[PDB]
Amino acid sequence: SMKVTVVGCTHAGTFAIKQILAEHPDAEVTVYERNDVISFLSCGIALYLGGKVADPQGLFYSSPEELQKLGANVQMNHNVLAIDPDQKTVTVEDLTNHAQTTESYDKLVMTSGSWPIVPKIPGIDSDRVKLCKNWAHAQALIEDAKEAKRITVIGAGYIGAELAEAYSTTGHDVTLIDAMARVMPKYFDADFTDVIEQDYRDHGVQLALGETVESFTDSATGLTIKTDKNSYETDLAILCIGFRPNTDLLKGKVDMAPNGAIITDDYMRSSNPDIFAAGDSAAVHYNPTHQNAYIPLATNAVRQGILVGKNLVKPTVKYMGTQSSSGLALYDRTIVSTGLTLAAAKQQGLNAEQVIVEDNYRPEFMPSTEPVLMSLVFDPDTHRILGGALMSKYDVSQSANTLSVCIQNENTIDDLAMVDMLFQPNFDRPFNYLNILAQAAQAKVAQSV
Amino acid sequence: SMKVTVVGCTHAGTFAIKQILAEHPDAEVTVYERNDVISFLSCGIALYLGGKVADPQGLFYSSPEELQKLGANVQMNHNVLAIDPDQKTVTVEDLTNHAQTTESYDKLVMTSGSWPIVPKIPGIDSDRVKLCKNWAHAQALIEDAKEAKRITVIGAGYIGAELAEAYSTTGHDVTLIDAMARVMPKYFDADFTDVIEQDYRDHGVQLALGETVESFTDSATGLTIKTDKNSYETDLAILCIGFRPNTDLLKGKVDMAPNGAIITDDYMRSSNPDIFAAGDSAAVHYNPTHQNAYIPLATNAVRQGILVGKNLVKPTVKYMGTQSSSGLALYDRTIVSTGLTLAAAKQQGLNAEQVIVEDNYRPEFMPSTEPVLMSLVFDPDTHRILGGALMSKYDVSQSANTLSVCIQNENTIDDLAMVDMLFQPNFDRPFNYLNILAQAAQAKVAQSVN
Ligand SMILES: Cc1cc2nc3c(=O)[nH]c(=O)nc-3n(C[C@H](O)[C@H](O)[C@H](O)COP(=O)(O)OP(=O)(O)OC[C@H]3O[C@@H](n4cnc5c(N)ncnc54)[C@H](O)[C@@H]3O)c2cc1C
Ligand SMILES: Cc1cc2nc3c(=O)[nH]c(=O)nc-3n(C[C@H](O)[C@H](O)[C@H](O)COP(=O)(O)OP(=O)(O)OC[C@H]3O[C@@H](n4cnc5c(N)ncnc54)[C@H](O)[C@@H]3O)c2cc1C
Ligand SMILES: NC(=O)C1=CN([C@@H]2O[C@H](COP(=O)(O)OP(=O)(O)OC[C@H]3O[C@@H](n4cnc5c(N)ncnc54)[C@H](O)[C@@H]3O)[C@@H](O)[C@H]2O)C=CC1
Ligand SMILES: NC(=O)C1=CN([C@@H]2O[C@H](COP(=O)(O)OP(=O)(O)OC[C@H]3O[C@@H](n4cnc5c(N)ncnc54)[C@H](O)[C@@H]3O)[C@@H](O)[C@H]2O)C=CC1
């Protein structure tokens, strides 16, 4: 029978394994994972630190026992040391007693994920510099937070943004550093991030944008962070400056993007037809540009894991690509986006324009309403939608998924301007705010004629 | 200059006129409207009666003066008496002095909308039987609600459902009657309406489903509504049993559906190439069946009005059809749908199956969460999505628009099962609840193959 080795098991491995066992229940699935847990939802770290998670065990949705019971041979506390695609073997280390074994496989599933970027900076080994990725890291932050009044968050991507918000609302003195000039520059245009930065300033967070850490130095009173433009004193520094694919086991053995992301076909197969990849080990197929990209999100892991299982024996279900839809909640605002920002489209040489629209999401005659700030990015010539974003105190998150479906189907601003959407004054004006947004894009293109 | 006559101006006429004047500023636009107002949002009636509207002037978004300022010749309080397409004339009555005039047109915009269905029943002329459509009706209801403790709502469609809830939450004794066995049968399947009906009962509303009124009889202490199965004593009856297209001016003169809805091409042109129709006077192109239908919603009026304006001279923008997406809020529940119910699909002989899924919309580890009851209706062979619905105390209304776009693009359950949707625990589980819904449809189709 078919022998399947799965390297790594947080989310992609978990979904791949369950899918493989459901659709090929004779297969012999072995999974290796360095940790002693699986399925930890790292989104819960900031939620716990912000006082929003009562029981942290609720942040796990599966377990080794569950996978074992389903028919998998589950090897926790094991570190895969080598993969030999020519001989189709893996060499593994039991972390409890150091014992090494070598095993054969017919199909290998590379769900080894990512690891935080850790720059080579003097002092980075300090006990006061911590990572924020897995359950081990979360437990350390849960313990440190009590004694750490002053917290420096290094990196203002999604992780840093959520941490800075969580610590600031729980009475800590927060400084937020990013190398770029704005917070979350990858995800929103300046009209959005200007508003978010002002929120941070209003809540007492110190912004240190356009700065890179040169050194960490311990002192009698805490940790000294020297940037190229300033020096900060802190009790705890959290490093969250992005992800690096954890794929060295296959470096030089399968096609990879420059950063090591495994390239796959539409069935999640690597350049080696017996080696699949899913999750943060793999590039995504990014529909707005029709290019490979590396934008690691749990949504990719659960989908690609399922596809590995469906395609393990022969191509069966095509990968649909992604829009990299994403969002978060900060200080009572919902902020969501999908596809390209205008900044990114222009940076990549694409033909792109944008409208920004601020409207109340439902009529003023209602008992209450809320402004929603909206962005639509489009090709001014083909009118193809390239991306969009929404921000409101009203929960507009579901509208980013509507835009995702629009992009998935290559819809234009003219489609979105008139496509049927319901009207009821509890929810919107006679035209939905997404119709209104696209109508403003029409008006921009028409004025350009 | 091109001469344009617009018959009727609540919403579709308003949007057509603004679009015409913007795209052809020189055209001479004359609009006739029976009432003395335009742009009244009838959705505000239930809201006002429910105590949710402070200033009812906020329920108007435009005005005769605004259209006049924009260049229209606005003839309020005028009633169009005749339309002769062969001669391209309209005959009109000034209601203030009965003066009639006849005018020529190059293009006519039929935005005459609809009127409530009023059946031929003994006693229906009573002062205690009221309509619930326009601003005149609203003002009458606002006055009478003060004294009438017992309200009978005749018709459990959207209007009736919202009225019953509005009156029930402001201290009235409400009885809700429908000829059909369920409330809102056109819009949701029984798993949803069973829940809504229980909601009405829990709030003291008396349901009289599967009953038709035989007579209204004034009695010593109120009005007696006689049905084929019971009798009810009320202080006010509201008749809201559907809309009829108000199209008699053109009956015999342009192709119509059996109920009088004007059939249009993809440019909103009637069978007479100089007469356009938009709004409740017109049929919609219903995408799930690819057939004409009559499902009057304000969403159609605003869209078709715009399209009339863009297509008045030459075909410029095609009509995309509709899924008839619709929904409402009742007792803290958001309830939305798009496309076909299972019941409707099978009543029309379509090949169709359904999955019902109830899940919390976001993870249980959050400080709160809410169940969402979901339905997906689909062709089990092609996998095409035919319709869907969601119900939750969390505001899931936007998800009905996601489904609408899925149907607009002829997407399948397999598309929806995997299409990219964001994950953040403030909003959903790793898979969005719409992904989860379609994955359950996938599981149902898989079980039926072996
Ligand atoms: C704080 C934080 C918050 C986040 N919030 C969100 C959010 O809100 N929404 C969203 O969509 N995404 C979010 N993400 C991203 C999401 O968590 C990741 O995309 C997801 O963890 C990737 O899943 P994965 O299974 O592919 O890889 P991983 O989670 O990285 O796990 C891969 C596993 O492989 C193991 N492994 C690696 N090498 C070996 C080896 N040689 N031998 C044995 N085992 C090995 C590792 O121990 C690891 O456990 C967040 C991430 C973080 C850190
Ligand atoms: C209580 C109520 C609540 C509603 N709630 C919603 C909701 O929440 N969401 C939604 O999408 N839809 C809702 N609707 C439906 C929506 O209001 C209608 O679809 C909309 O009014 C149709 O607009 P219209 O301009 O095409 O037609 P109409 O509003 O019917 O206006 C047509 C106009 O033409 C005039 N007219 C007719 N004949 C003549 C003539 N010979 N001469 C001169 N004038 C004439 C009439 O006076 C009328 O003003 C609701 C309707 C009602 C009654
Ligand atoms: N709500 C959501 O969707 C969430 C998803 N994630 C995703 O997990 C992955 C990792 O998250 P992040 O660590 O925040 O990565 P990120 O890619 O989202 O942000 C990294 C930030 O670090 C900055 N940066 C890079 N190098 C730096 C340096 N030397 N010094 C200072 N700043 C530097 C970058 O300008 C960038 O803003 C991302 O793909 C993220 O989208 C994580 C948390 C929440
Ligand atoms: N939130 C929303 O979308 C709303 C939109 N509307 C729309 O306005 C239009 C008219 O609204 P409604 O009057 O509610 O029509 P409707 O078509 O929604 O419902 C009419 C109801 O009356 C029943 N009925 C028909 N004849 C009857 C009879 N002789 N006796 C008793 N019951 C009878 C029907 O079974 C039906 O349930 C509809 O198209 C509606 O969708 C109106 C209010 C709110």
TrEMBL record, chain A:
InterPro entries registered for this protein in UniProt: FAD-bd_OxRdtase, FAD/NAD-bd_sf, FAD/NAD-binding_dom, FAD/NAD-linked_Rdtase_dimer_sf, Pyr_nucl-diS_OxRdtase_dimer
UniProt binding sites for NADH: 158-159, 162, 178, 186-187, 242, 327
Pfam families associated with the record: Pyr_redox_2, Pyr_redox_dim
UniProt keyword terms in alphabetical order: FAD, Flavoprotein, Nucleotide-binding, Oxidation, Oxidoreductase, Redox-active center
Record bears the keyword RNA-binding: no
Gene3D superfamilies named among the record's database cross-references: 3.30.390.30, FAD/NAD(P)-binding domain (3.50.50.60)
All copies of domain FAD/NAD(P)-binding, residue ranges: 2-305
Cofactor(s) required, per the database record: FAD
Start and end residues of each Pyridine nucleotide-disulphide oxidoreductase dimerisation domain: 334-428
Membrane-spanning ranges: none
Top-level division of the source organism's lineage: Bacteria
Single annotated GO MF: oxidoreductase activity
Binding site for FAD: 10-12, 33, 79-80, 114, 133, 158, 280, 298-299, 423
Family: Belongs to the class-III pyridine nucleotide-disulfide oxidoreductase family.
PANTHER family in the record: NAD(P)H SULFUR OXIDOREDUCTASE (COA-DEPENDENT) (PTHR43429:SF1), PYRIDINE NUCLEOTIDE-DISULFIDE OXIDOREDUCTASE DOMAIN-CONTAINING (PTHR43429)
Protein name according to UniProt: Uncharacterized NAD(FAD)-dependent dehydrogenase
Native source organism of the sequence: Levilactobacillus brevis (strain ATCC 367 / BCRC 12310 / CIP 105137 / JCM 1170 / LMG 11437 / NCIMB 947 / NCTC 947) (Lactobacillus brevis)
